[PDB]
Coordinates of C-alpha atoms in Angstrom, one line a residue:
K1 CA 53.1 -43.2 -70.0
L2 CA 54.8 -42.9 -66.8
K3 CA 58.7 -43.2 -66.7
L4 CA 61.0 -43.3 -63.7
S5 CA 62.4 -39.8 -64.3
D6 CA 58.8 -38.2 -64.3
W7 CA 58.5 -38.9 -60.2
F8 CA 61.7 -40.4 -58.8
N9 CA 65.0 -38.9 -58.3
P10 CA 67.8 -40.9 -56.3
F11 CA 70.3 -38.1 -56.3
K12 CA 68.3 -36.7 -53.6
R13 CA 69.5 -39.3 -51.1
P14 CA 73.0 -40.2 -51.9
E15 CA 73.9 -41.9 -48.8
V16 CA 71.5 -44.8 -49.2
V17 CA 70.9 -47.5 -51.7
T18 CA 68.3 -45.9 -54.4
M19 CA 68.6 -48.0 -57.0
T20 CA 69.2 -52.2 -57.8
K21 CA 71.1 -53.8 -60.5
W22 CA 67.7 -55.0 -62.0
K23 CA 66.3 -51.3 -62.4
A24 CA 64.0 -51.2 -59.5
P25 CA 63.9 -47.9 -57.2
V26 CA 64.5 -48.0 -53.5
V27 CA 61.8 -45.4 -52.2
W28 CA 63.2 -43.0 -49.4
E29 CA 61.9 -39.7 -48.1
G30 CA 63.2 -37.2 -50.5
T31 CA 63.3 -39.3 -53.9
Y32 CA 59.7 -39.2 -55.0
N33 CA 57.0 -36.7 -56.3
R34 CA 53.9 -37.3 -54.8
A35 CA 52.0 -34.5 -56.3
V36 CA 52.9 -35.9 -60.2
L37 CA 51.8 -39.6 -59.1
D38 CA 48.5 -38.5 -57.3
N39 CA 47.7 -36.5 -60.7
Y40 CA 48.4 -39.8 -63.0
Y41 CA 46.8 -42.3 -60.9
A42 CA 43.4 -40.1 -60.4
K43 CA 43.2 -39.6 -64.1
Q44 CA 43.4 -43.5 -64.4
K45 CA 40.8 -43.6 -61.4
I46 CA 42.4 -46.5 -59.5
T47 CA 41.2 -48.2 -56.4
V48 CA 43.9 -49.8 -53.9
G49 CA 43.2 -52.5 -51.8
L50 CA 44.6 -53.6 -47.8
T51 CA 44.3 -57.2 -46.3
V52 CA 44.9 -57.6 -42.7
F53 CA 44.5 -60.9 -40.5
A54 CA 43.3 -60.5 -36.5
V55 CA 43.3 -63.8 -34.9
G56 CA 43.4 -64.3 -31.2
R57 CA 42.2 -63.3 -27.8
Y58 CA 43.7 -59.8 -27.9
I59 CA 43.6 -59.0 -31.4
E60 CA 40.6 -56.3 -31.1
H61 CA 43.1 -53.9 -29.8
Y62 CA 45.7 -54.2 -32.7
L63 CA 43.1 -53.9 -35.1
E64 CA 41.6 -50.7 -33.6
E65 CA 44.8 -48.8 -33.8
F66 CA 45.8 -50.4 -37.4
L67 CA 42.8 -49.4 -38.9
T68 CA 42.4 -45.8 -37.2
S69 CA 45.6 -45.1 -38.5
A70 CA 45.3 -46.6 -42.0
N71 CA 42.2 -44.6 -42.4
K72 CA 44.3 -41.5 -41.6
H73 CA 47.1 -42.2 -43.9
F74 CA 47.1 -44.8 -46.4
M75 CA 46.4 -43.6 -49.9
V76 CA 44.6 -40.4 -49.1
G77 CA 43.2 -39.0 -52.1
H78 CA 42.1 -42.3 -53.8
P79 CA 39.3 -45.1 -53.2
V80 CA 40.6 -47.8 -50.5
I81 CA 39.0 -51.5 -49.6
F82 CA 40.0 -52.8 -46.1
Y83 CA 39.6 -56.7 -46.2
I84 CA 39.5 -57.6 -42.7
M85 CA 40.0 -61.6 -42.1
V86 CA 38.9 -62.5 -38.3
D87 CA 38.5 -65.9 -36.6
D88 CA 35.5 -63.9 -34.3
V89 CA 33.5 -61.3 -35.6
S90 CA 33.0 -60.4 -32.0
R91 CA 36.6 -58.8 -32.2
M92 CA 35.9 -56.7 -34.9
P93 CA 35.6 -53.2 -33.5
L94 CA 33.9 -50.2 -35.3
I95 CA 35.9 -47.8 -36.6
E96 CA 34.7 -44.8 -38.7
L97 CA 36.0 -44.8 -42.1
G98 CA 36.6 -41.6 -44.4
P99 CA 35.2 -40.5 -47.8
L100 CA 36.1 -43.3 -50.3
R101 CA 37.0 -45.9 -47.8
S102 CA 34.9 -49.2 -47.3
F103 CA 35.2 -52.6 -45.8
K104 CA 34.6 -56.1 -46.2
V105 CA 35.1 -58.8 -43.2
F106 CA 35.3 -62.7 -43.7
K107 CA 35.4 -65.2 -40.6
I108 CA 38.2 -67.6 -41.0
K109 CA 38.7 -71.1 -39.2
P110 CA 41.7 -70.7 -37.0
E111 CA 44.6 -73.1 -36.9
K112 CA 46.1 -74.8 -33.9
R113 CA 50.0 -73.5 -34.3
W114 CA 50.6 -69.8 -34.5
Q115 CA 53.3 -70.8 -37.1
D116 CA 50.5 -72.5 -39.6
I117 CA 48.3 -69.3 -38.7
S118 CA 50.8 -67.5 -40.0
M119 CA 51.5 -69.5 -43.1
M120 CA 48.0 -70.1 -44.0
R121 CA 47.5 -66.6 -44.6
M122 CA 49.0 -67.2 -48.1
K123 CA 46.3 -69.6 -49.1
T124 CA 43.3 -67.4 -47.9
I125 CA 45.0 -64.4 -49.7
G126 CA 45.2 -66.3 -53.0
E127 CA 41.4 -67.5 -52.7
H128 CA 40.1 -64.1 -51.9
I129 CA 42.0 -62.9 -55.1
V130 CA 40.3 -65.2 -57.4
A131 CA 37.0 -65.2 -55.8
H132 CA 36.6 -60.9 -55.7
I133 CA 39.7 -58.8 -55.3
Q134 CA 41.2 -59.1 -59.0
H135 CA 37.6 -57.3 -59.8
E136 CA 37.6 -54.9 -57.2
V137 CA 41.2 -53.4 -57.1
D138 CA 44.1 -52.1 -59.3
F139 CA 46.7 -52.6 -56.5
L140 CA 46.8 -54.9 -53.3
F141 CA 48.9 -54.5 -50.4
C142 CA 49.1 -57.4 -47.6
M143 CA 50.2 -56.5 -44.1
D144 CA 50.6 -57.6 -40.5
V145 CA 48.0 -56.2 -37.8
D146 CA 50.7 -55.4 -35.4
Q147 CA 52.1 -52.1 -36.7
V148 CA 50.5 -48.5 -36.8
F149 CA 50.8 -45.8 -39.7
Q150 CA 52.5 -42.7 -38.7
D151 CA 52.5 -40.4 -41.7
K152 CA 51.4 -40.4 -45.6
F153 CA 51.8 -43.9 -46.8
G154 CA 50.8 -43.1 -50.7
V155 CA 51.1 -43.7 -54.3
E156 CA 54.7 -43.6 -54.2
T157 CA 54.5 -47.1 -53.2
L158 CA 52.7 -48.6 -55.7
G159 CA 53.9 -51.1 -58.6
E160 CA 53.8 -54.6 -60.0
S161 CA 55.5 -56.0 -57.3
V162 CA 56.5 -54.3 -54.1
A163 CA 58.8 -55.6 -51.3
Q164 CA 59.6 -54.1 -47.6
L165 CA 63.2 -53.9 -46.6
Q166 CA 63.3 -54.9 -42.9
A167 CA 64.3 -52.2 -40.6
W168 CA 67.1 -54.4 -38.4
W169 CA 69.0 -55.7 -41.4
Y170 CA 69.2 -53.2 -44.3
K171 CA 72.8 -52.3 -44.0
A172 CA 74.0 -55.9 -43.1
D173 CA 76.1 -58.2 -45.3
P174 CA 74.0 -61.0 -47.1
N175 CA 75.8 -64.1 -45.3
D176 CA 74.6 -62.5 -42.3
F177 CA 70.9 -62.4 -43.4
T178 CA 68.7 -65.1 -41.5
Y179 CA 67.4 -66.8 -44.8
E180 CA 66.7 -70.5 -44.6
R181 CA 69.8 -72.5 -45.1
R182 CA 69.1 -76.0 -45.0
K183 CA 69.4 -77.6 -48.9
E184 CA 66.5 -79.8 -47.8
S185 CA 63.7 -77.0 -47.7
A186 CA 62.0 -75.1 -50.8
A187 CA 63.1 -71.7 -49.2
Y188 CA 67.1 -72.6 -49.2
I189 CA 69.5 -69.8 -50.2
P190 CA 73.3 -70.4 -50.2
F191 CA 75.7 -68.3 -48.4
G192 CA 77.0 -65.5 -50.9
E193 CA 73.4 -65.4 -52.6
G194 CA 70.8 -62.8 -52.2
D195 CA 70.2 -59.0 -52.5
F196 CA 68.1 -57.9 -49.6
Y197 CA 66.6 -59.2 -46.4
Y198 CA 62.5 -58.2 -47.2
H199 CA 60.1 -58.1 -44.3
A200 CA 57.1 -60.3 -44.4
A201 CA 55.0 -57.6 -42.7
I202 CA 54.3 -55.5 -45.9
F203 CA 54.3 -56.9 -49.3
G204 CA 52.2 -55.9 -52.3
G205 CA 51.6 -55.5 -56.3
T206 CA 48.9 -56.0 -58.8
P207 CA 46.3 -58.9 -57.9
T208 CA 47.9 -60.7 -60.6
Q209 CA 51.4 -60.5 -58.9
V210 CA 50.1 -60.8 -55.4
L211 CA 48.3 -64.2 -56.5
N212 CA 51.9 -65.5 -57.7
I213 CA 53.5 -64.6 -54.7
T214 CA 51.1 -66.2 -52.4
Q215 CA 50.5 -69.3 -54.2
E216 CA 54.5 -69.7 -54.9
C217 CA 54.8 -69.2 -51.1
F218 CA 52.2 -71.6 -50.1
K219 CA 53.5 -74.4 -52.4
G220 CA 57.0 -74.1 -50.8
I221 CA 55.2 -74.4 -47.2
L222 CA 53.6 -77.8 -48.3
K223 CA 56.6 -79.0 -50.1
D224 CA 58.3 -78.6 -46.9
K225 CA 55.6 -79.8 -44.3
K226 CA 55.2 -83.2 -46.6
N227 CA 59.2 -83.7 -46.0
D228 CA 58.9 -82.7 -42.0
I229 CA 60.7 -79.4 -42.1
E230 CA 59.6 -76.0 -41.2
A231 CA 61.4 -73.0 -42.2
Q232 CA 63.6 -70.9 -40.0
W233 CA 60.8 -67.9 -40.1
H234 CA 58.0 -69.4 -41.7
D235 CA 56.2 -67.7 -44.5
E236 CA 59.1 -64.7 -44.3
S237 CA 61.7 -67.5 -45.4
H238 CA 59.3 -68.6 -48.3
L239 CA 59.1 -64.8 -49.3
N240 CA 62.6 -63.8 -49.3
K241 CA 63.1 -67.1 -51.8
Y242 CA 60.3 -65.8 -53.9
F243 CA 61.7 -62.5 -54.4
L244 CA 65.3 -63.8 -55.0
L245 CA 63.9 -65.7 -58.1
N246 CA 61.2 -63.1 -59.0
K247 CA 62.8 -59.6 -58.4
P248 CA 60.3 -57.1 -57.0
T249 CA 59.6 -54.0 -59.3
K250 CA 59.7 -51.6 -56.3
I251 CA 61.2 -51.3 -52.9
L252 CA 60.2 -49.3 -49.9
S253 CA 63.0 -48.2 -47.3
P254 CA 62.6 -48.8 -43.8
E255 CA 61.1 -45.7 -43.2
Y256 CA 58.1 -47.4 -44.4
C257 CA 58.4 -50.0 -41.5
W258 CA 60.5 -48.9 -38.8
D259 CA 61.5 -50.3 -35.3
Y260 CA 62.1 -47.4 -33.0
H261 CA 63.9 -50.1 -30.5
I262 CA 66.7 -49.5 -32.9
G263 CA 66.8 -45.8 -32.1
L264 CA 66.7 -43.1 -34.8
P265 CA 69.6 -42.6 -37.1
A266 CA 70.2 -40.4 -39.8
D267 CA 69.2 -42.6 -42.5
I268 CA 65.4 -42.4 -41.1
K269 CA 64.2 -39.1 -42.2
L270 CA 60.3 -39.5 -42.0
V271 CA 58.6 -42.3 -40.6
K272 CA 55.5 -43.7 -42.2
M273 CA 54.6 -46.7 -40.4
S274 CA 56.3 -48.3 -37.1
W275 CA 56.5 -51.7 -35.2
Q276 CA 54.2 -52.5 -32.3
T277 CA 55.9 -54.2 -29.5
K278 CA 55.8 -58.2 -30.2

């Protein structure tokens, strides 16, 4: 079947990290051959899923820009299903979708604290994987709503388990990473340990691996709540502990989730998705 050499050439980007000690690629602009992968996956007849949560008074605005840009740029050439989780179907806008795209919308019960809202996403995603997503798609991404696609985000991003490098920390020393540092938390990581600081705004994989990501994260959130502690960065702290223990089979460069408030240095060649103001 497919080997890394068929589509990935790390030597095209010599000035950045392109490979990990556990053999996973870090996908940067210039390293990938999308045409080879489009042909490969079209012969396999894949479908890709994308989950997004939109809760609160002013979300409808973020959802419109997210979905308009996703329709334009996410996995063009392949079927896609958008899964939209909302607290009031009023705030679901009408976005016209293109060929081979469709959507499903679900009402969720909103939580009181903005921290548990963010965290309880992990339970809901897993529930929907078991009930239907496992039977509908071959790969699944889970994304925050307050970001916008800017250029092609395609099949070069697919894999068994997929993590995103956080734009502010990708060149930093691991002792400076904002991991959870209390031994009492299920998310604890000691100083001198860790590979990268991953962003919780994008993660993905097969439905099987995304179920394992979300349920292990949710178990850690519950264990902490029962010991009356909340991790420094909530679900993202648990996500970073998960990916230290269960290494991702693919990593995306900060070009795939860029914050323009940093600027635009030479490492950032073509931006596929950008932060909204938070």
